Design an enzyme around this catalytic site. Structure first.
Site, PDB file in Angstrom:
ATOM      1  N   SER A 214      -2.818  20.010 -16.288  1.00 26.63           N
ATOM      2  CA  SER A 214      -1.502  19.969 -15.620  1.00 26.63           C
ATOM      3  C   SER A 214      -0.658  21.193 -15.988  1.00 26.63           C
ATOM      4  O   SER A 214      -1.044  22.328 -15.685  1.00 26.63           O
ATOM      5  CB  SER A 214      -0.760  18.675 -15.982  1.00 26.63           C
ATOM      6  N   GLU A 347      -6.093  13.104  -7.123  1.00 23.49           N
ATOM      7  CA  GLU A 347      -4.945  13.584  -7.908  1.00 23.49           C
ATOM      8  C   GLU A 347      -3.643  12.835  -7.623  1.00 23.49           C
ATOM      9  O   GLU A 347      -3.030  12.277  -8.529  1.00 23.49           O
ATOM     10  CB  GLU A 347      -4.711  15.077  -7.657  1.00 23.49           C
ATOM     11  N   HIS A 467      -4.805  11.942 -11.362  1.00 27.56           N
ATOM     12  CA  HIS A 467      -4.431  13.000 -12.273  1.00 27.56           C
ATOM     13  C   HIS A 467      -4.272  12.442 -13.719  1.00 27.56           C
ATOM     14  O   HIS A 467      -3.687  11.366 -13.899  1.00 27.56           O
ATOM     15  CB  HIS A 467      -3.139  13.628 -11.757  1.00 27.56           C
TER      16      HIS A 467
END
Length: 566
Positions: A214, A347, A467
């Site tokens: 990230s 995601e 994610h």
């Protein structure tokens, strides 16, 4: 976050502390640094392995008082032996579980781990940069435990850096010396330390890999983009992010005043008087109010964080981002080291929580003008050309007559992750020596082993690989448990840590000594590829064309009339 997850986390926090004392040994050890001697302790894992643990090694001066918002300075060396058998505090931030502010301005430390202080050969060094949108995160072992990686013969290093406004305040006036990107300047300084000191822990200073997820991926990418880090490391892994993601930079020079005003400042908008206020404000007040800084327009244009990496207004000694990231890729030294990049298979599923609070967001897909890349879209998002771009996006993700939450979360996957990756690869191709980039796609779904981010995204009992779902297979955390060694979860730990250490070692992720990889032909991406090939990681490992490719070409077609901005 709920009252149940608060008492439940409170209990795991008390359990992790007793487990941590339990998994401690009496075997202290001393290692050299260029700043002096440091004392580590050996610890245990729940798989009955052990490792040496050096925590709270300062790599910069405490950035308090008159160093607040300032670039970091080197720490003061010491005689004697510094105690490094305990963690220091995290950077001041909002606790996502409680909502309370925690952490401290004294936060600039790194942790070092290894199963063997005196290896018979120099080992690959792996540097993890945590994510958390530059506003949360830490290097504590209840979130990023080194237990899986120390099964391998590497040296693992978890760094910390200044978060939020304390990390990324930016003021125009050249006299005040607050260009911005202080948190990234932290990351640079820690890299410089790791370069000069890893050898003392058995690491190879000429084989250093940096990686992150990230915001950590964008940080990693920035460490590959800036001149300041040139030659410091040798491999990079970008997990679900890079520096041209729309959330990974912002021009926030005007937002300091807004922050000052929320915190009770009285006076005019000049930088000097704003700086003086913010310089004497309590840290936990500034952090608590960041959430209120963004205007309704900015949220509408999908600005995600008020403070973050920015193009610095003027150049100073430790400048990190002197141009917009797209421009920096054209000269980046990091283009010429081996790189791995990847995403998870769903995601945007991360945004389930946000949709639960704002169901009105799903209506944004009726035109999708809000998701048009901001550099193409108009201010009000009302221009007919913007309605035309929005339509191309709409065709890519709205499956039926009305948009759904799934359509929404699928869009996000591309807006925030897949489309940026694509633009980066194409940009890089035009400016590279030709060093390989390898793609992976993480597609392994499991509810049987999780991490704290699943508490925040409200991912409890939700199918799909969101994610951060992959962090669980790299690091131990206080919500983990010992898995049978024949479990799919355990095999995935082994594979994931196997591939990463293998890439770290050789600049090539393929190994036939990794289970499931016997039929795998992992080729890197070529400039002449119309279609991307990626290793799909699930219960089985399989090379495939990236499934997101068609939708990626859709997003690209928005730049049909504006190919210079691609």
């Amino acid at each position: 976050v709920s009252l149940m997850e608060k008492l439940k986390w409170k209990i795991k926090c008390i359990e992790n502390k007793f487990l941590n004392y339990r998994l401690t040994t009496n075997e202290t050890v001393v290692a050299e640094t260029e700043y002096g001697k440091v004392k580590g302790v050996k610890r245990l894992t729940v798989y009955d392995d052990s490792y040496y643990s050096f925590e709270g090694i300062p790599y910069a001066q405490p950035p308090v008082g008159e160093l607040r918002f300032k670039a970091p300075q080197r720490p003061t060396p010491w005689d004697g032996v510094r105690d490094c058998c305990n963690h220091k505090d995290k950077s001041v931030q909002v606790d996502f579980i409680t909502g309370k502010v925690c952490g401290s301005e004294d936060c600039l430390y790194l942790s070092v781990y290894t199963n063997n202080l005196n290896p018979e050969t120099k080992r690959p060094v792996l540097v993890y940069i945590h994510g958390g949108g530059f506003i949360i995160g830490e290097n504590h072992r209840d979130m990023y435990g080194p237990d899986y990686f120390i099964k391998k013969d590497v040296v693992l290093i978890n760094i910390q850096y200044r978060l939020g406004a304390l990390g990324f305040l930016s003021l125009n006036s050249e006299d005040l010396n607050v260009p911005g990107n202080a948190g990234l300047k932290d990351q640079v300084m820690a890299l410089r330390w790791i370069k000069n000191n890893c050898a003392n822990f058995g690491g190879n200073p000429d084989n250093i890999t940096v990686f992150g997820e990230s915001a950590g991926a964008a940080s990693t990418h920035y460490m590959m983009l800036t001149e300041q880090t040139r030659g410091l490391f040798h491999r990079g892994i970008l997990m679900s992010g890079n520096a041209i993601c729309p959330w990974a930079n912002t021009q926030c020079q005007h937002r300091a005043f807004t922050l000052a005003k929320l915190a009770g400042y009285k006076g005019e908008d000049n930088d000097k008087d704003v700086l003086e206020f913010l310089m004497k404000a309590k840290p936990q007040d500034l952090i608590k109010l960041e959430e209120k800084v963004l205007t309704l327009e900015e949220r509408t244009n999908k600005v995600m964080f008020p403070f973050g990496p920015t193009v610095e207004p003027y150049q100073t000694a430790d400048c990190v981002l002197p141009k917009h990231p797209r421009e920096m890729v054209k000269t980046a030294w990091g283009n010429s080291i081996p790189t791995m990049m990847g995403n998870t298979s769903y995601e945007g599923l991360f945004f389930t929580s946000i949709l639960k609070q704002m169901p009105l967001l799903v209506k944004e897909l009726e035109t999708c003008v809000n998701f048009v890349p901001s550099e193409l879209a108009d201010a009000e998002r009302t221009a007919p050309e913007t309605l035309e771009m929005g339509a191309k996006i709409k065709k890519a993700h709205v499956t039926g007559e009305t948009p759904t939450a799934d359509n929404f979360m699928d869009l996000c996957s591309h807006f925030y992750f897949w489309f940026p990756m694509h633009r980066l690869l194409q940009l890089r191709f035009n400016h590279t020596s030709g060093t390989p980039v390898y793609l992976y796609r993480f597609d392994f779904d499991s509810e049987d082993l999780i991490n704290p981010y699943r508490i925040m995204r409200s991912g409890r009992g939700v199918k799909g690989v969101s994610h951060t779902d992959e962090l669980t297979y790299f690091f131990w955390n206080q919500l983990a448990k010992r898995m049978p060694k024949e479990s799919r979860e355990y095999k995935t730990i082994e594979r994931m840590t196997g591939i990463w250490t293998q890439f770290a070692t050789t600049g090539n992720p393929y190994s036939n000594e990794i289970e499931g990889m016997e039929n795998v032909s992992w080729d890197p991406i070529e400039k002449s590829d119309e279609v991307y090939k990626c290793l799909n990681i699930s219960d089985e490992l399989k090379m495939i064309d990236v499934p997101e490719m068609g939708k990626i070409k859709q997003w690209e077609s928005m730049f049909e009339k504006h190919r210079d901005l691609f």
